[PDB]
Amino acid sequence: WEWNVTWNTSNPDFTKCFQNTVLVWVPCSYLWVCFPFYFLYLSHHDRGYIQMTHLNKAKTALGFLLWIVCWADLFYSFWLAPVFLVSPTLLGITMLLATFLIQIERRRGVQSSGIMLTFWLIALLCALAILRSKIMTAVFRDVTFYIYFSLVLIQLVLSCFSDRSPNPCPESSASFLSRITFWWITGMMVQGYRQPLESTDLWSLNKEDTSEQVVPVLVKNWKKECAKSRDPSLFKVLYKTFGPYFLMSFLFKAVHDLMMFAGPEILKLLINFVNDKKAPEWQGYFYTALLFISACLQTLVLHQYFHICFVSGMRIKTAVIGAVYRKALVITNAARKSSTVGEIVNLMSVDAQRFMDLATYINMIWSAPLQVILALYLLWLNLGPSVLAGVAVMVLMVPLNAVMAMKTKTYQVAHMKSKDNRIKLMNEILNGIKVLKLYAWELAFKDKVLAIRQEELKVLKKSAYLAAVGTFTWVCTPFLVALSTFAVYVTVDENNILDAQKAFVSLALFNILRFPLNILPMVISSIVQASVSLKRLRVFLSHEDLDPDSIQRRPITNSITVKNATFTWARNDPPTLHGITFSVPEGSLVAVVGQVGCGKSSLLSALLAEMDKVEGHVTVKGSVAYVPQQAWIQNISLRENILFGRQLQERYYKAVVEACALLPDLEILPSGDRTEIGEKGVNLSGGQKQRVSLARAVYCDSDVYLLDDPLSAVDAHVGKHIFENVIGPKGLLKNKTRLLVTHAISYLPQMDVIIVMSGGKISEMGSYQELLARDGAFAEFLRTYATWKLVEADKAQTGQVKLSVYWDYMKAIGLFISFLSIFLFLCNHVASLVSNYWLSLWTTQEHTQVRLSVYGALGISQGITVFGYSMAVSIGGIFASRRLHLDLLHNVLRSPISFFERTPSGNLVNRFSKELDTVDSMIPQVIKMFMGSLFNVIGACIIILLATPMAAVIIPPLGLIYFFVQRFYVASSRQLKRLESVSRSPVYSHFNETLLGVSVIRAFEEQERFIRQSDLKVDENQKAYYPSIVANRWLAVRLECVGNCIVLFASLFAVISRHSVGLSVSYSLQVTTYLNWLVRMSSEMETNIVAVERLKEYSETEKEAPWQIQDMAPPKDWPQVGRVEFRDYGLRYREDLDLVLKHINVTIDGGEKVGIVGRTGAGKSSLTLGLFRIKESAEGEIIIDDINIAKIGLHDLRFKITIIPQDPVLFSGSLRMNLDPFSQYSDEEVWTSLELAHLKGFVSALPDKLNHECAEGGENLSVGQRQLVCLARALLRKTKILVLDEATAAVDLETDDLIQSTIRTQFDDCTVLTIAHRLNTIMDYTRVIVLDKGEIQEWGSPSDLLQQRGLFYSMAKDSGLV
Ligand SMILES: Nc1ncnc2c1ncn2[C@@H]1O[C@H](COP(=O)(O)OP(=O)(O)OP(=O)(O)O)[C@@H](O)[C@H]1O
Ligand SMILES: [Mg+2]
């Protein structure tokens, strides 16, 4: 090796020894270092074995022949030079390793080899170099090399084709080149250009990324971790699960850094050749070719690294969602109260996003130091032994930034904890929107949600401040280090030789150092956010687990054999069931009776292993079917609700439908048992829900039935019919154990055992006959008798996002920030341009100091502007997020009830949880980066145009070739993002539906089907998400290669056309980067803008009538008498179907108690909706005290009309907040109301009294005590209209009489419209007006109706009052 023949001569020729040693050691060596490592992948990853094909054999045979040929050389050498022995043998054995490798790759099922193609490629290049040398030299050993080269070339061509496999994703069957270039997606891309993509174009999900193939691994690893540590660390299981696939990203990142650092060196060498005519031209071309191949390989390896990181993040998100769902289905009640529904919704919505953000930057926590250390070491041997001073700066800056970052972790904890409270509050708002709108409590909760949002948005401002200050130090680090090391370098010794050339090199290198330190703030912020989101996930996954071994669920004497067990709702709270002991024989109908909050329902929940056992033995035998007190209904057709995971059996299904009085219900529905039933059963009535919930349990034939009051909402006749045909001894369940919890006693004589439970312990136990002779606590009670698809789905828009969206976001940000931020951007970029100009243009130690001072001033000015615009962008983004949340909340609240009926409660959760996450976090940073890239591009174009008049006809084409591909990419990226969000919404819907009814699912042992449904929905979401990232890589690969094809032309021109412009080579290198970056950023912003678009989607939806009308204002004492009078009133349930009320005309007098009563599906709960303007009246006019209701607003009417809703619902927070959320009543007033509603005897014993912490939706209370709270609210309001929408249904007889007496006493001067199914209360009323089929039938006093022997007489006959 000497420079005369290898570099100095115009003939590019390697030396003979170099040819025979290094050129042969390179390829053989590559396979030797990769071979061992490759077994890891070949072993850990398997796909079967490929069959015997001609291609595989062709490759194997050529591998055998190639080895022979190489050993044939050793034979001829055996037949002086030392290299003529070792080299042929080494090549033969590495060749024997190559053929063995394709063999094992066949065995392990790999169609395209990631090593063979590269191995042959490198071998080919080495052979090409020797080939050219051997053909320039000119039989004996040359012909062996020609045979070797031809065989290697054919082997390389063969290795490109993909072998046979052992609407799927093409990634599995794509060839190596297609996989490395992401070619296989281009079809979708061009498809997205023809017409917008739909969900059907989105391909299927790979088997490796599927939910059922990812979640079980993490779940098993978590069980192992939580079993070894009898507290476990979530980090250990997380990396043990997601490390083997991620280490490839580490390898690719190392290669990308080692190849990127070569780029500037090759550029510098090229710019010295072009600026020199004393070097053989061949050297210049070689430089351009080397730069081109280096840039191409750099982009390929970088984009492989990025794809691996993104895929790992996607898998992490899928695993996190699956594990959260499984734990939520497994969680216990106490932990469920501790870990609110907002916490779970945040865990599978914003937390995984933090993990995928961490996935991109975790690989940089070693790359950035590595680059910094490499640059510092190279400067050590470039400038001298004075760079250590710069080290001191890192020792005086890093700790500060670390201390500052540590404060952010205590600032993100409150940010991610004040988000769960808001999400929980909005979940309770959406679950009980009907009551929250019937009580006019809209702004009472609108001004309450904007009290946890502004607590969550303030810590965001503080964290943004700490992030801007943290990036300030990183942006000023280089210049400060330069100043410190130069101040030391001059004094470190007599080395004051800061010559322009040296100073120039050091300054350019220190500028290069800016790239590793410009990504550190994002890495640190992502690490902090991921640790904050890791703590919460570890806490949630470490909660207490329900124990199904507490109750011996023996399969199949006595079905239930409770043995003095003392159950409790939570570990620390005092027990609720004390010393319960009973034994129910098989088939014996048992009726639990007592009072409100006595433990009747708690007993069934304790027999379901849903309630903690202090001690005792329970042996409920068989399969248990549960009918909850509040019916649980999903969003499917009524037929599937009845089936509930069972195949249809006409013989049984028809009998079940007939028995539970469902034929009358399956005749008024639009299409019988094929109509969409709504998310929460809103399509059904209050009594039909109970019948459907009972039919679901009856169809699922079990051995033990725990009926928690299944006849608490149906009228007397239908209840009798159901009991006789289902629950009685002559029904379908005549040979099944039935714990029929009942409040109103009518079938007690037909009971077998009557459990009288009071206080919490079984106070009495015996049949009807054995309880009439006790003459005690309970005997005196008996003596005294006390198709269209209604729910739609989120639909993506087709086309470009309207600028209106951009305009609304800009208006949300404001004007002052929209100009100050732009000014800071522009000033920063112009300062950078001048710093680059001066360092370059200006390239006398009096000048050296001046140059150093001005450079430091420019760097500090750049840092100041960077910090300033980061602050401005963060503040503007927070302002925009606040405004957007306010607008979205107002739009949701102002929407009518029908909107909530047709929109599933997973779209709203999506807008308020995930889209808001994007608006707060991703959009500001994306806008900042896009603005920076755009301004950089404009500045670079300007500086080229000003300093090069010739380069004026290339700017328009260069802009066009990038604008066209930008459009071609965004046209599909927008639709991919839209489908991602649309497919995501269902997941939230399913999570809410499951979390609502966990108890029923556990009781029916039907967890697997719901787990599979959640897996399917998450699979659809990831099917929508994966093409987005794949298209991201495709766009970048094409752009970074298209721009890289240009620099090649510039380099060649600079070289080939110089004697007959050294700047263009670097200009193309510099500008193309800005152009590509800019394009990417634009697309990114566009995609994120989609989120804002969806937040706007609810604005155009038609809303309710104006809440307050100032022109039409009622007097303060407007309801003087409450003379309700319906004139021609007809209400239509939905616009398509027919009228539900046909020309009713009713004249109610002031203060006259009305007792509206009718059969099921008679439109009883239509006057209640109409009187509150819940649904606009197609025709008719309700007039209260001479003023039409339709003319007044809404809040005026709502506040002044009291209602007791059919479904008792208690919002989260304190018990007081469920009474006066406006805080308009004193403590004494509320306490008087409590004793008025007969609840003071329960709240007093509570340790927190009035401020007791209610659970999510009120499960902390009973169902009768939740109705007593509604009665307390009605007493507190105390208004002259008291429509009772089927109230007092879930309370015992004596409590019913007590609250009836309270209503009769304190509400004897109001126009109360008591809709009820218990006719005994309606008997002592002034008008018992009857509705039958939407038309008026009876009109008069109850006595007149009874004597008329009409419909009401038959109704009186059915109940048992005649
Ligand atoms: N989810 C819960 N968390 C905590 N305590 C609860 C919960 N559910 C019930 N309790 C406690 O158990 C008591 C009894 O409730 P339960 O609903 O069993 O009474 P009940 O008499 O069957 O009610 P109802 O008359 O409405 O049928 C409540 O008053 C409350 O103290
Ligand atoms: Mg109950």
Swiss-Prot record:
EC number of the protein: 7.6.2.2, 7.6.2.3
Description of activity control: MK 571 inhibits sphingosine 1-phosphate and leukotriene C4 export.
The name this protein goes by in its record = Multidrug resistance-associated protein 1
What keywords would UniProt list here?
ATP-binding, Cell membrane, Glycoprotein, Hydrolase, Lipid transport, Membrane, Nucleotide-binding, Phosphoprotein, Repeat, Translocase, Transmembrane, Transmembrane helix, Transport
Residues reported to bind ATP 2? G1158, R1159, T1160, G1161, A1162, G1163, K1164, S1165
Give the record's family classification: Belongs to the ABC transporter superfamily. ABCC family. Conjugate transporter (TC 3.A.1.208) subfamily.
**SUPFAM superfamilies given in the database record:** ABC transporter transmembrane region, P-loop containing nucleoside triphosphate hydrolases
Source species: Bos taurus
**Gene symbol of the encoding locus:** ABCC1
Per the record, ranges on the Cytoplasmic side are 40-59, 100-111, 164-237, 306-361, 407-468, 533-810, 883-925, 969-1039, 1079-1362
Instruction: Return the GO cellular component terms, semicolon-separated.
Output: basolateral plasma membrane
* Organ and tissue specificity: Expressed in heart, spleen, lung, kidney, skeletal muscle, mammary gland and weaker in brain and liver.
Query: Reaction catalysed?
Result: ATP + H2O + xenobioticSide 1 = ADP + phosphate + xenobioticSide 2; an S-substituted glutathione(in) + ATP + H2O = an S-substituted glutathione(out) + ADP + phosphate + H(+); sphing-4-enine 1-phosphate(in) + ATP + H2O = sphing-4-enine 1-phosphate(out) + ADP + phosphate + H(+); leukotriene C4(in) + ATP + H2O = leukotriene C4(out) + ADP + phosphate + H(+)
The UniProt transmembrane annotation reads: 19-39, 60-79, 80-99, 112-132, 143-163, 238-258, 285-305, 362-382, 386-406, 469-489, 512-532, 811-831, 862-882, 926-946, 948-968, 1040-1060, 1061-1078
- Show where the ABC transporter domain sits: 560-784, 1124-1358
Domain (ABC transmembrane type-1) spans 246-529, 818-1087
